[PDB]
Each structure stands twice: as C-alpha cells, then as structure tokens.
UniProtKB/Swiss-Prot annotation, chains A, B:
GO biological process, one term: negative regulation of smooth muscle cell chemotaxis
Phenotype upon changing D98A: Reduces affinity for glutathione. Slightly reduced catalytic activity
Keyword line: Acetylation, Cytoplasm, Lipid metabolism, Mitochondrion, Nucleus, Phosphoprotein, Transferase
Top-level EC class: transferase
GO cellular component terms listed in the entry, alphabetical order: cytoplasm; cytosol; extracellular exosome; extracellular region; extracellular space; ficolin-1-rich granule lumen; mitochondrion; nucleus
Protein name as it appears in the record: Glutathione S-transferase P
Species: Homo sapiens
N6-succinyllysine PTM positions: K102, K115
Length: 209, 209
C-alpha cells in the first residue's frame, strides 16, 4: 500500500480486485482512462502488454488482472492456508479466467449471434464450480478452506455478470447461488457493491451485458 | 512427488512443465491418453473442467497447466526469491498464457486463413518479453532476479513453438534469442529436449505447427 488502479471507467477485469480491496477494508485511488486518453497512445505504450489494468502498490507497478489478484492474495493472505489450499485457489482462478475469456469473447466478438449458444452451454461451465463448492464442508463457507481467497472475489464477479447476462442461470445451482448471497452479505463488500463508485459503472466497455 | 502427468500424446500444454521437471532433475510417470480413450468418455468426466492435463503429485491431483506450473514453482522454489520476483513471475506467465491462447486459437480455429495475420502481429506480441528481459541485469541472467522460475520454462516453450510457426521470428529480438539459447544449453534440459520422449512428440494435436 498505498494502492492505485489504472483502468477504463468500467468494471471488467478490475471488478474482482476492487471487491477484494473493499472487503479487506483497504483503500485505493482510481485513475480513470477515457477512451480518448487511451487513443493518444502514450500510456498504452508505457504498458507491458499494451493493456490495462495497471496497478500500483507502494513502489510496485503491476499489470494483468490475475497478477494483481495473486499479488494481493499473497500479501494480504488470501491465498489459502497451505500448499493444498493454495493449489485449489489457483485451480479455481484458472477456471474463472477460462470462462471469463469466453464471456469476453461473446461480449466483444459476437454478442448477438452467439448469445443463445453461450447461455445454452453456461450450465455445463458453471457445474465445475458448483461441484467444487459441494466438496468443501458442504459449501456452507468458501470454495477453498474456511477463509476467503482472491479467487473467491474473481468467481463472485464471474457469477454476478452471468446473472445479468442470463438472469436465473444460477437457479439450477443452489450452492453457487447461496455463495453469491453469502459473500455479497459481507459488510464491507455489501457497502462497496451498493456504492455509486460501483453501481454507476458499466460492466463492459462496449455497453453490452 | 512422485509425479504423474496425464495427457494426450503431444507437447501442447505439458511441454513447459515437462521441461521444468527434467531441468530440476525430477523423474515422472507419463500416462498417455489416446483420442480413443478420451472418446470412451469416462476420463473426461472425471476431470475438474473436462480437460487435460491432469497432474498427480503425491496425494495431490491437479488440473490446469498453469496450476501445475505454479504448484511446481511453489514446492520446488521456482517462484522468485521475494514478493517482487513472485509478482513479476506471474506477470511473465500471464503474458505467455495470453499469447499461447492466441496461438492455440490459430492452430485449431483457422491455421490457413489467419496464419499470415498472426505472424504479422507476432513481433508486437513478443516485444513485451524482450523488454522485460532487458530490464533485469541486461538480459544476461534469468528473466526474474537471478534464479530460474516456472514461468521461464513456459516462456521458453512459447518461444520454441513460434520458431516452428514462423522461423526467424526471433531475429528481431536478440535478447529473447540469447535467452532461448541460454536455457536450452542447460545440461538436464538439453538432454530432455534431445530425447526421443520429446522429439517423437508432435507439438500440437491436429498435425499443424
């Protein structure tokens, strides 16, 4: 700390990491990059893989949403209690990333043409998480162990946006539904999710959700 | 330990972790899965996300090539010496994963139609790693700090398969070239890359490279 997240004025790949910071009672600054400011190309080139989010933590400058989540989990202790929980946290995050990629591909590559196929395939994509949740203390707590991980925030966000995409896509998944309710109920997080900072923010950049 | 990798008879997403194990003087079991077995169905259904590789390490069963790389990096000490190195390691591995996905998309989605555009865009995709390499002791030692990390094997593989795809794509990147040369020269690794076990394996599964 202190933290600074450099991103576009959307939730996108910063949603999860912001929920993590909020829930852990951390403060951060928001440097917004207008589409126009991105178009000048000066920042762009300063970025490692020519992309955002860019994240500053004290003297550390990070790139890649997943690198920021692992850094945060590693420094804030949200990476499992042992090597086993640590490996399952990753396993869950890799799963989240894979589906987020398909989601992003839909939104930006062909929302209209393939939205139905995507939703028809959604159930089989969500099941793995439902299954992981059942193998951990009956899914009453978290997905890995008894303490929250950075992957929990990423998965939470993943689930939130697919609710907007396919309302009720979670009905056939009671464990994941209860999960979303449990985590969203967390005081600090609930307050962030209910804030203008979040609510007035569009899920994606192209205005599709 | 002991380690067992469950995968298709190809290099694909197991090439990097296999070079890691070998270079680290580790031995492993190879349980090959044929298309005929995968078709049978049962193995697929027992995989977390319906995919391979599947990795066994002692009593731990893992899925997701990157989860396995991180587990190995975490257990074998191949994840940097501190917090900074650890974040830069993830940062490097996230970038390799990003290009590896584009590469996989090409090979399996439209090799013929988009190969030229891909190779035209390649230079810009490789530059970020060239830059990272130049910022650590002049690109003379390891990519991060001064010890090997799991990301190095994954990046090495990524660079190797793009040499086959576009021979000489590294000529414009003298740092990455020397990198490949440096790591490939490592005794245990060199021995593995030069073995039948590796040589007789096709990079991909659809006969394209």
């Amino acid at each position: 700390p202190p933290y600074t997240v450099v991103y576009f004025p959307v939730r996108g790949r910063c949603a999860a990491l912001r929920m993590l910071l909020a829930d852990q009672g951390q403060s951060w600054k928001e440097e917004v990059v207008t589409v126009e400011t991105w178009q000048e190309g000066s920042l762009k080139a300063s970025c490692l893989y020519g992309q955002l989010p860019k994240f500053q933590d004290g003297d550390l400058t990070l790139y890649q949403s997943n690198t920021i989540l692992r850094h945060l989990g590693r420094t804030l202790g949200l990476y499992g209690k042992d090597q086993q929980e640590a490996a399952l946290v990753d396993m869950v995050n890799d799963g989240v990333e894979d589906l987020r990629c398909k989601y992003i591909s839909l939104i930006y590559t062909n929302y209209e043409a393939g939205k139905d196929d995507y939703v028809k395939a959604l159930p089989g994509q969500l099941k793995p998480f439902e299954t992981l949740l059942s193998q951990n203390q009956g899914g009453k707590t978290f997905i890995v162990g008894d303490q929250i991980s950075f992957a929990a925030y990423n998965l939470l966000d993943l689930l939130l946006i697919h609710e907007v995409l396919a309302p009720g896509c979670l009905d056939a998944f009671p464990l994941l539904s209860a999960y979303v309710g449990r985590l969203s109920a967390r005081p600090k997080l609930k307050a962030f999710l209910a804030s203008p900072e979040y609510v007035n923010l569009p899920i994606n950049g192209n205005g599709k959700q």
